[PDB]
Structure 1
Amino acid sequence: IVGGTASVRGEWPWQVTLHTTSPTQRHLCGGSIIGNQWILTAAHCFYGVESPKILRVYSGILNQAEIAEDTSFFGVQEIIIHDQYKMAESGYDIALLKLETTVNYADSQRPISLPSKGDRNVIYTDCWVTGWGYRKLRDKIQNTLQKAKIPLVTNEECQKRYRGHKITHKMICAGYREGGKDACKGDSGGPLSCKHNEVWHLVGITSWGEGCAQRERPGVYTNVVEYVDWILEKTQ
């Protein structure tokens, strides 16, 4: 996260850190708890991942330093990538991780609500992006989970900023005209969480953008409300 601040322990209890153990263990991507056995994340995170056996999901983490060889984790039974996914920039950048065991919910770890199809008309004014990613384009994975408040921008406005791309209705954009706050490398797969009527909703999945936090280059996120039928279908 560029231009953010450290999170409070437990304030984003749906946020997980997905690790790979190959060749040695490291953070791979963010993700969100959406059900007892289910993490929602980005499809592009699994480039070159041949097997779910190299994955570990850690929940209830603030600092990466909490994760040691003796720290408990959730195994991944199945990676489910959207069948129309080809690459992040062309959309469908969405994946489900079916966990080997179920998450026991607590103040440190609990699911985020998916948006309702009836909330497409809602104007979210309280949206946050979170993760352990770089704080500049050229950086490293951070110890402490970072957060940044970022305004949504219209698809028409976003499309103006990405003339070489097609910004579809299955994408959603967020950023400041002047830049300065954005997701960056290592934040992908994590949530864009918007608070509305005292309830947090998983509005976006961190997907792509041109560099990080640049002027007139909003972040692009998977528009989660467009995938609620897919999620239901795949989680049955």
Structure 2
Amino acid sequence: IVGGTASVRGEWPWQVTLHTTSPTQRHLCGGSIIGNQWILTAAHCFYGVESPKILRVYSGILNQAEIAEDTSFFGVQEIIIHDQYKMAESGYDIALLKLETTVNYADSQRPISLPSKGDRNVIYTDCWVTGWGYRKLRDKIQNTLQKAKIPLVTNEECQKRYRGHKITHKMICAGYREGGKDACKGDSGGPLSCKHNEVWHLVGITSWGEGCAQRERPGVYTNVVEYVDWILEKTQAV
């Protein structure tokens, strides 16, 4: 996260840090708890990932330092990538992680509600992006979860900033005309939370952007509401 500040512990209870153990353990992506056995994250986070066995999901984390060899985690039973996903910039950058065990909810770890189709008209004015990603272009994974309040921009406005891309209605952008605050590498899979009517909604999933926090270069996110049917279908037992 660029231009953000340190989060208060437990302030974003749905935020998880997804680690890979190969070659050695490290933070791979952010993710959001949306069900007792489900994490919603970005598809491009699993590039080169041949098996869910090298993945570890850590919930209720503020500082990466809390994570040690003796720290408990949730194993991943299955990685579900949208069948139309090819790459972040083309859309469909969404994936579900089915955990091997269930998450016991508490003040430090709870699910974030998904947006409703009837809210596609709502005008979220209190949106925040969070993660342990880069604080700059040439940076590295941060210890403390960062947060930044960022205003959403219309898709038409976003399209103007990315003339070489197709900003579809399945994408949503957020950023300041002058830049300064934005998600960055490492924040991928992270949630773009917006508080509406005293309730937090998972509006977007950190997906991509040209650089980080540059002027006239809004961050691009997966428009979650456009995938509620997909999520319902993929999360139903088999």
For Structure 1 versus Structure 2, the TM-score category normalised by the shorter chain is: over 0.9
Partner SS for 1:71: coil
Q: Deviations over 1:110-145 (max 9, x none)?
A: 000000000000000000000000100100100000
Partner SS for 1:77: strand
CA distance in 1, matches of 2:168, 2:228: 17
Q: Deviations over 1:134-172 (max 9, x none)?
A: 100100100000000000000000000000000000000
> How far off is 1:13 after superposition?
0.1
CA distance in 2, matches of 1:31, 1:174: 18
CA distance in 2, matches of 1:138, 1:119: 37
Partner SS for 1:160: helix
> How far off is 1:108 after superposition?
0.1
Instruction: Give TM-score scaled by structure 2 length.
Output: 0.99
Aligned to 1:205: 205
Aligned length: 236
Q: Deviations over 1:69-115 (max 9, x none)?
A: 00000000000000000000000000000000000000000000000
Q: Deviations over 1:179-231 (max 9, x none)?
A: 00000110000100000000000000000000000000000000000000000
Partner SS for 2:39: strand
CA distance in 2, matches of 1:6, 1:53: 31
CA distance in 2, matches of 1:202, 1:167: 20
Consecutive unaligned residues in structure 2, runs of 5 or more: none
RMSD of the TM alignment (CA)? 0.2
CA distance in 2, matches of 1:49, 1:229: 26
Aligned to 2:10: 10
